[PDB]
C-alpha cells in the first residue's frame, strides 16, 4: 500500500501517546516536558516525508477510515483530507511547536505545574491538527471548538488572577459569536447540499449563494480577530509567553483564514462576499497597525502586529488569491513565533518586565536576542529574499494589480508603512539608547534551550521562504508585467515607515514636553473600542437580565397571573362560603329562596 496514508495518519497518532501517558509515572517526574518535546520533534521529522512525496509527484489523498453514523441519507465518517494545505501546514506547525516547547522548558522552569503546561500545549496541537486535516464540517467544528477551549484554559493559566479569567472568558465570548456563523453554514450546507464533507459541497455548489459564505466569513472573523471581533486577541496576552507564541501568534489565530482557504472554490464564484472579506481585512489591518504604534507593552505590540498580518491574509483572500494567503500563513508563523520568543527572553531577563519604557540598551547586553529580533523584524517588513518577502511582496503586487476597492488598497499600503513603524518602535525602545531597568542586572541568555530554539526558528525565518517558494508547483498566474513604481511600492512605503518612525522616535530625546494630541489618545486607547463595547452592551444585557427577565417576569408577573391569582380567588371564595354565623333563620330563608327558584326555573321547563 502507499506509505503516504500510513505516514500522514501516524504523524497525527503519535502526538496522542503522551496524553495516554499523562496518567503514568513519567507524568509525575521532571522528564515529562522533555518527553513531550521529543515526541513533537519525532512527529515533525515523520511529517517531513509526505511533504517530500507531494513535492515530488503532487500526491493528495482523502482517508475515510471510521464510519461514525448514518442519518438516513447523510453518512458521517472520520475522514482526513491530505491535500497540499494539510501536508504543508502540519510540518510548519510541528516545527514551531518543537521550538516553542524547547523554549518553554527554560521559560517555565520554576512553574510547579509545568507538566500540566506541556500536556495543555500538546492538547492544543492535537486539536489544531484535527482542525487542519478535517474533511467534513463536523470534524472541522470539533477542531474549532477544541482549539477554542484549549485557548481558554491556557489564557487563564494563572487562575488566581482576575484579569486572566476575564480575558479567557472574553476570548470564549468572541469566538462563540463567530461560532454562530459556523453553525449557520453547517445547517445551510446540510439542508441544501445534503452533505458536510468538502467533496459533495464543492460538487453541488457551482454558484454558491450569500448565506453559507457569509456564515463562513463570520466564523473566520471571530477566529482570526477581525475588526468587529478584534479586541480578544490583544487581551489574550494575559497567558504565559509560550502560549502567546504558539496559539495567539502563529498557529491558532490563522484558523479562521484557513477556513476561508478551505472553501475557496465556493468563494471565488461570489463577488459580494469577496468584497466583504477584502474590506473587512483592510480595515482590520490598518486599524490594528495604527493601534500598535503607540503601545508600550511589548507583547501588546506584537499581538497587534499579528492582528494586522491576519488582516493582510484576509485582503489577499478577498482578491481571490487563496494559495498566496496560505503561503503567507506558513511564512508568518516562523518570524512571528521567533519575535514572541525574543520578547519572552527579554521579559525573563528583566525580572518579568514587559514595558518597553523600562527596557534600555539591550543591543550589546543580549546580543543573540538582538540579532534574532532584528532578523525577525526585517522578515516582517518584507526585506527582500527573506521569508516574509516571498509572501508579502507578492500580496502587495497582487492587490496593486487587481480590480479592487480603492479605499481597501490605500488602507493596505498605509498599513504596510505602519508595520515598519511599529517594528522601528520595538527596536528603538527595547535595544537602543541607555538602560532604563532596575540596577540589579540579571541579564542572562546563556541557556542552550533558549539559544537552540531561537536558532532553529531563525534559520527558518531566513531560508524557509526561498525553499518553500521554489519547491511548490505554480498555483497562480504570475504578475510579470507592471509599471516600475508599482513594482517597488512595498519597499518604498516600508522605507517611509522606517524613516518617519525613526524621526519621531529621535525627537523624544529633546528636552521638550507637550501634552498629547487627540489622535494619539485615539491610537493608544485602541480607538476607544474596548472602553465602549466592553461596558455599554455588557451593562445593558446584565441589567435587563436582572431587572426584566428575572424580577419583572419570573418573580412578579408570571407569579401574578397564574398561581397568585388562583390562590387569591380561591381564598376569597373560601372566606365568603365559610363565613356563616350558624343561625338557622338565615339558612332556612335561603332554603325557601332555593325552593322557589327550583319551582320556577326548572319545574316550569319540561
Amino acid at each position: 500500500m502507499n506509505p503516504f496514508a500510513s505516514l500522514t495518519l501516524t504523524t497525527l497518532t503519535i502526538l496522542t501517546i503522551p496524553i495516554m501517558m499523562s496518567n503514568s509515572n513519567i507524568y509525575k517526574t521532571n522528564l515529562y516536558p522533555n518527553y513531550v518535546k521529543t515526541t513533537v520533534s519525532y512527529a515533525f521529522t515523520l511529517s517531513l516525508v509526505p511533504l517530500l512525496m507531494f513535492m515530488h509527484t503532487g500526491q493528495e489523498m482523502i482517508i475515510s477510515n471510521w464510519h461514525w453514523m448514518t442519518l438516513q441519507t447523510v453518512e458521517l465518517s472520520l475522514s482526513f483530507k491530505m491535500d497540499y494545505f494539510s501536508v504543508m501546514f502540519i510540518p510548519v506547525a510541528l516545527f514551531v511547536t518543537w521550538s516553542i516547547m524547547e523554549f518553554s522548558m527554560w521559560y517555565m522552569h520554576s512553574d510547579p505545574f509545568i507538566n500540566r503546561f506541556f500536556k495543555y500545549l500538546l492538547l492544543f496541537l492535537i486539536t489544531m491538527m484535527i482542525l487542519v486535516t478535517a474533511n467534513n464540517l463536523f470534524q472541522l467544528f470539533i477542531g474549532w471548538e477544541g482549539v477554542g477551549i484549549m485557548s481558554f484554559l491556557l489564557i487563564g493559566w494563572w487562575h488566581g488572577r482576575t484579569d486572566a479569567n476575564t480575558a479567557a472568558l472574553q476570548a470564549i465570548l468572541y469566538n462563540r459569536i463567530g461560532d454562530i456563523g459556523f453553525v449557520l453554514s453547517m445547517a445551510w450546507f446540510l439542508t441544501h447540499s445534503n452533505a458536510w464533507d468538502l467533496q459533495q459541497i464543492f460538487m453541488l455548489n457551482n454558484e454558491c449563494p450569500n448565506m453559507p459564505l457569509i456564515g463562513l466569513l463570520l466564523a473566520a472573523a471571530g477566529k482570526s480577530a477581525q475588526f468587529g471581533l478584534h479586541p480578544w486577541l490583544p487581551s489574550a496576552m494575559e497567558g504565559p509567553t509560550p502560549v502567546s507564541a504558539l496559539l495567539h501568534s502563529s498557529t491558532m489565530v490563522v484558523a479562521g483564514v484557513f477556513l476561508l482557504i478551505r472553501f475557496y472554490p465556493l468563494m471565488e464564484t461570489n463577488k459580494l462576499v469577496q468584497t466583504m472579506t477584502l474590506c473587512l481585512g483592510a480595515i482590520t489591518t490598518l486599524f490594528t497597525a495604527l493601534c500598535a504604534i503607540t503601545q508600550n507593552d511589548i507583547k501588546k505590540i506584537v499581538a497587534f502586529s499579528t492582528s494586522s498580518q491576519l488582516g493582510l491574509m484576509m485582503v489577499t483572500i478577498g482578491i481571490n488569491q487563496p494559495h498566496l494567503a496560505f503561503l503567507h500563513i506558513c511564512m508568518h508563523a516562523f518570524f512571528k513565533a521567533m519575535l514572541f520568543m525574543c520578547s519572552g527572553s527579554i521579559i525573563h531577563s528583566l525580572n518579568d518586565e514587559q514595558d518597553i519604557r523600562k527596557m534600555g540598551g539591550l543591543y550589546k547586553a543580549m546580543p543573540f536576542t538582538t540579532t534574532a529580533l532584528i532578523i525577525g523584524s526585517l522578515a516582517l517588513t518584507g526585506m527582500p529574499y527573506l521569508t516574509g518577502f516571498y509572501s508579502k511582496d507578492l500580496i502587495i503586487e497582487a492587490v496593486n494589480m487587481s480590480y479592487t476597492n480603492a479605499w481597501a488598497l490605500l488602507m493596505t499600503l498605509i498599513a504596510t508603512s505602519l508595520t515598519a513603524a511599529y517594528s522601528t518602535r520595538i527596536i528603538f525602545f527595547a535595544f537602543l539608547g541607555k538602560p532604563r531597568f532596575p540596577p540589579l542586572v540579571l541579564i542572562n541568555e546563556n541557556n542552550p534551550l533558549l539559544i537552540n530554539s531561537i536558532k532553529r526558528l531563525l534559520i527558518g525565518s531566513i531560508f524557509a521562504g526561498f525553499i518553500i517558494s521554489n519547491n511548490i508547483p505554480p498555483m497562480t498566474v504570475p504578475n510579470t508585467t507592471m509599471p516600475l513604481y508599482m513594482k517597488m511600492t512595498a519597499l518604498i512605503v516600508t522605507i517611509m515607515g522606517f524613516m518617519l518612525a525613526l524621526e519621531l522616535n529621535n525627537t523624544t530625546y529633546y528636552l521638550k514636553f507637550k501634552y498629547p494630541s487627540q489622535t494619539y489618545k485615539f491610537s493608544n486607547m485602541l480607538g476607544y473600542y474596548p472602553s465602549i463595547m466592553h461596558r455599554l452592551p455588557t451593562y445593558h444585557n446584565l441589567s435587563m437580565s436582572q431587572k426584566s427577565a428575572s424580577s419583572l417576569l419570573d418573580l412578579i408577573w408570571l407569579e401574578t397571573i397564574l398561581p397568585k391569582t388562583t390562590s387569591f380567588i380561591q381564598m376569597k371564595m373560601s372566606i365568603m362560603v365559610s363565613n356563616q354565623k350558624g343561625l338557622i333563620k338565615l339558612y332556612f330563608l335561603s332554603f325557601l329562596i332555593t325552593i322557589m327558584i327550583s319551582m320556577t326555573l326548572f319545574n316550569y321547563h319540561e
Binding site: H159, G160, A168, L169, D179, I180, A187, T191, A549, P563
Partner: protein, 459 residues
C-alpha cells in the same frame, strides 16, 4: 419486560429485611445489577418496536430512557447516604422505598402500550417525589415547593385524562399501535383545537414550557439531592416522551397550533439563559439551564421532523446526565459549607483539584462541546429549525452564546480566584463523591462512540 419489573419490585422486601448497616450496600449492588440487565433492551429492530406482551412494549425511544432510569437509581443511592447518616433505620428504609417506587413507576410508564396506563403511572410518579421533597428537604420553603410541584402538574394533566377517555369513546382503543395505524387527520374546528390543547398542555407543563415553569426552580432548589437528580434527569423527559407519542393524532392541527408554543420556547430559552447570568443561588442556575435546554427540546418536538425528533432524543439523554452531574457537584460544596450562595466559597480549584476537573468537564458538556452528544442533539435540532425557517438561527445562535457565558461563569465563580479566608472546614474529596462524578461522566463520553443508540426511532 417483567425481567426488569420483578427485580425492581424485589428491591423493596430486600431493603426492608436487610441489616441496619447493610441497606446502602445491598440496594446499590442490586440496582446496578438491574441496570446491567436493562441494558439488553438497547437491541432494537428498526421497522417496529419490541412488543413483549399486550401491556408492555419497548421502542428505540423508550430503551435509552429506561436505561437512564435504572442507572440513575444507584447514583441517587450513593449521593443520598451522606446526608442521611444521622437518620433512623426505618426512615432510611422509607427513603430507599420512595426511590424504588419512583423507579418502578417510571419503568412501567416508559413501556406502557396503552395511553390510560401510561397516564396512571405518569401521575403515580408524583406521589414519591412529593413525599421526598416535603419530608427530606432542608428548608421551610420545601412545603410551598411541594404545592407548586403538585398543582402545576395536575392542572395540566386532569384535562388530558378527559381527552383520553373521550378519544377511546370515538376511536374505540387507546393502544398506541392501534392509534398509530388507524390515525386520522384532525379537522379545523374549535372542538379539535381544545382537544389538541388538552392533549398537549400536560406535557407542556412537565417540560416545563416557558411561562409554566415557575414550579421547577422551587421544586429543584428545595429538594434533597436524589430528588433533584431524578427530577431533572428523568421526570422532565416524561413530558418530551409523552409529546412524541401523542403528536401522532394531532396532525395536521399542529401545523398551526404550535406557533405560540414555538414563540414561547425560543424567546423563553433566551430569557432563561439570560436569567442564569444573574443568579445568586447555585442550584437555581442549574434549574434555569434545564429550563432552557427543555425549551430547545420543545421546539424540536413541535416542528415534527425526523432530524428534530432525533435531536430531541439525544438532547434529552445528554441533558439528563449533565444536569444530574451538575446537581451532585453543587451538593458536594453545599455539604462542605451549608450554603447555596455561589460567591460564598471561591477558589476551590486550589483546595479541591480533582473536583475542579469534574466541574470543568460538566461545564464543557453543559455548553455542548463537540463531539459530545449534547451538541449532537443541539445541532440536529438547530438544523431542523433552520429548515423550518432560516431566521431561527438568530435566536438559536444567541442561546448558544449565552449558554457558554453562564456555564464558564459558574466555573469561574466557584473554582477560580482566591479562596475565602474564613472558610476553613473544606475537607478533601471523598472516594464516594469522586466515584459518583465518574459514574456520571464516563457513560456520557462513551455514548459519543455509539450515538445511534440514543438517536431514537427515526434513526
Amino acid at each position: 419486560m417483567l425481567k426488569i419489573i420483578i427485580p425492581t419490585t424485589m428491591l423493596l422486601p430486600m431493603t426492608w429485611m436487610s441489616k441496619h448497616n447493610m441497606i446502602w450496600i445491598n440496594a446499590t449492588v442490586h440496582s446496578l445489577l438491574i441496570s446491567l440487565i436493562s441494558l439488553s433492551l438497547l437491541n432494537q429492530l428498526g421497522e417496529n418496536s419490541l412488543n413483549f406482551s399486550l401491556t408492555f412494549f419497548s421502542d428505540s425511544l423508550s430503551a435509552p430512557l429506561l436505561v437512564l432510569t435504572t442507572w440513575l437509581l444507584p447514583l441517587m443511592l450513593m449521593a443520598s447516604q451522606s446526608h442521611l447518616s444521622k437518620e433512623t433505620t426505618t426512615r432510611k428504609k422509607l427513603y430507599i422505598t420512595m426511590l424504588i417506587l419512583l423507579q418502578l413507576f417510571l419503568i412501567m410508564t416508559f413501556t406502557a402500550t396503552e395511553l390510560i396506563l401510561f397516564y396512571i403511572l405518569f401521575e403515580a410518579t408524583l406521589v414519591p417525589t412529593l413525599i421526598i421533597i416535603t419530608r427530606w428537604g432542608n428548608q421551610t420553603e420545601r412545603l410551598n415547593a411541594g404545592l407548586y410541584f403538585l398543582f402545576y402538574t395536575l392542572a395540566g394533566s386532569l384535562p388530558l385524562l378527559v381527552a383520553l377517555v373521550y378519544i377511546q369513546n370515538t376511536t374505540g382503543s387507546l393502544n398506541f399501535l392501534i392509534i398509530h395505524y388507524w390515525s386520522h387527520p384532525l379537522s379545523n374546528s374549535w372542538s379539535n383545537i381544545f382537544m389538541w390543547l388538552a392533549c398537549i398542555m400536560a406535557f407542556m407543563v412537565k417540560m416545563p414550557l416557558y411561562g409554566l415553569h415557575l414550579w421547577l426552580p422551587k421544586a429543584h432548589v428545595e429538594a434533597p439531592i436524589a430528588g433533584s437528580m431524578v427530577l431533572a434527569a428523568v421526570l422532565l423527559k416524561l413530558g418530551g416522551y409523552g409529546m412524541m407519542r401523542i403528536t401522532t393524532i394531532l396532525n395536521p392541527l399542529t401545523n398551526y397550533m404550535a406557533y405560540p408554543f414555538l414563540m414561547l420556547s425560543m424567546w423563553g430559552m433566551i430569557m432563561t439563559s439570560s436569567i442564569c447570568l444573574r443568579q445568586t443561588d447555585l442550584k437555581s442556575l442549574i434549574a434555569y439551564s434545564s429550563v432552557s435546554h427543555m425549551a430547545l427540546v420543545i421546539v424540536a418536538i413541535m416542528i415534527q421532523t425526523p432530524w428534530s425528533f432525533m435531536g430531541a432524543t439525544a438532547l434529552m439523554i445528554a441533558h439528563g446526565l449533565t444536569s444530574s452531574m451538575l446537581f451532585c457537584l453543587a451538593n458536594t460544596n453545599y455539604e462542605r459549607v451549608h450554603s447555596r450562595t455561589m460567591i460564598l466559597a471561591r477558589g476551590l480549584q486550589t483546595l479541591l483539584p480533582l473536583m475542579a476537573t469534574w466541574w470543568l468537564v460538566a461545564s464543557l458538556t453543559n455548553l455542548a462541546l463537540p463531539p459530545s452528544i449534547n451538541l449532537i442533539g443541539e445541532l440536529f435540532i438547530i438544523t431542523a429549525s433552520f429548515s423550518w425557517s432560516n431566521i431561527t438561527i438568530i435566536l438559536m445562535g444567541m442561546n448558544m452564546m449565552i449558554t457558554a457565558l453562564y456555564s464558564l461563569y459558574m466555573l469561574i465563580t466557584t473554582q477560580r480566584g482566591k479562596y475565602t479566608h474564613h472558610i476553613n472546614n473544606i475537607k478533601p474529596s471523598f472516594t464516594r463523591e469522586n466515584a459518583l462524578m465518574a459514574l456520571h461522566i464516563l457513560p456520557l463520553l462513551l455514548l459519543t462512540l455509539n450515538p445511534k443508540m440514543i438517536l431514537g426511532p427515526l434513526y
